[PDB]
Amino acid sequence: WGYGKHNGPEHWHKDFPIAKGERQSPVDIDTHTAKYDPSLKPLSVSYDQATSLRILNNGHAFNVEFDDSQDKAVLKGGPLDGTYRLIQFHFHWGSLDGQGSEHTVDKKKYAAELHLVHWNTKYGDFGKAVQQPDGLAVLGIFLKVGSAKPGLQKVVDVLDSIKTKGKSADFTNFDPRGLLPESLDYWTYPGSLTTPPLLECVTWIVLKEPISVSSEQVLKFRKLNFNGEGEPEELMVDNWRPAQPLKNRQIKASFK
């Protein structure tokens, strides 16, 4: 599977039937139809004792992995019940600034979108979490083009080393707090993974406030390769899945 005409999102259903399920992601967030929910508690993002380990190019994006063998960088509060451990984070971006985010706000697409992945600790491990309806919590954050995001340059500078599919490199002491916007106001709804196996186990928390990154910083994302070393070069761009039908679901807001 991939993002090409012949193996892109419109073909995924052939191997992963759930692609046409009842709670798939991403989706369009209709701000006026969203319901401000007063019962929603505050989001509690605790990244102070976080430990990054490696950065890897998996052929569809690059993942910064974290040591989740202890509660070090966790997510809780908001719509969640229980603690979720941060396992990794990746992005989805476009070939042009006007596209790239998976989720959209009133049909508006951003240049990229960050996914901080967390799994519910009551299920023992990531593999067990994906066998549960409330197994994962992904914190989504939109990227717009403007000023440079300082907390992003360490990531951007390492991309030279992970150009092709399969490469990785040590990436310790990275602080994910530098990728968070000032506000934690969010939209929340029950969805899925946006890439196969597309399992429906995610409680999506998409933040209202976007972060800014320079034009220079996004380009470097576009220099990565989908292919491995010694194969025709395919620039890793447009690695995003379009909005899916909302169906019998309502998006709730933490603000008004």
Ligand X SMILES: NS(=O)(=O)c1ccc(C(=O)NCCCCNCS)cc1
DSSP β-ladder status, 62-66 and 35-36: unpaired
Name the residue among 52, 40, 26 with its Cα closest to residue 177: 52
Q: What are phi and psi of 82, to 5 degrees?
A: 115, 175
Beta carbons of 16 and 192 less than 8 angstroms apart: no
9 binds ligand X (CB under 6 A): no
Q: How far is the CB of 197 from ligand X (least distance, A)?
A: 4
Residue 164 marked as a ligand binder: no
Residue 118 marked as a ligand binder: no
Instruction: Closer to Zn ion by CB, 54 or 122: give it.
Output: 54
Tell me, residue by residue from 202 to 231, as one string, x for binding to ligand X by CB under 6 A and - for no binding.
x-----------------------------
Residue 195 marked as a ligand binder: yes
Please, which residues bridge with residue 85 across strands?
74, 119
Name the residue among 58, 56, 67, 86 with its Cα closest to residue 155: 56
Q: Of the candidates 18, 40, 130, 253, which one interacts with ligand X according to CB under 6 A? A: 130
Instruction: Closer to ligand X by CB, 120 or 195: give it.
Output: 195
Q: Which stretch binds ligand X (CB under 6 A): 5-13, 29-37, 165-173, 189-197?
A: 189-197
115 binds ligand X (CB under 6 A): yes
Please report, in angstroms and rounded to a whole number, the separation of the first and last CA atoms in the chain: 40
Q: How far is the CB of 79 from ligand X (least distance, A)?
A: 16
Name the residue among 90, 79, 86 with its Cα closest to residue 46: 86
- Our answer to whether residue 60 is catalytic in this structure is yes
195 binds ligand X (CB under 6 A): yes
CA distance 159 to 63: 11
CA distances from 36 to 24, 39, 111 (A): 22, 9, 27
Instruction: Closer to ligand X by CB, 135 or 210: give it.
Output: 135
182-211 residues in contact with Hg ion (CB under 5 A) are 199, 201
DSSP β-ladder status, 112-120 and 136-145: antiparallel
76 binds ligand X (CB under 6 A): no
Number of neighbouring beta carbons within 10 Å of residue 19? 20
197 binds ligand X (CB under 6 A): yes
Set 6, 13, 32, 60: catalytic member = 60
Q: Which residues bind Hg ion (CB under 5 A)?
A: 199, 201
Which segments are annotated as binding site?
90, 92, 115, 194-195
Residues within the interface to Zn ion (CB under 5 A): 115
**Which residues are near ligand X by CB under 6 A?**
115, 117, 130, 138, 193-195, 197, 202
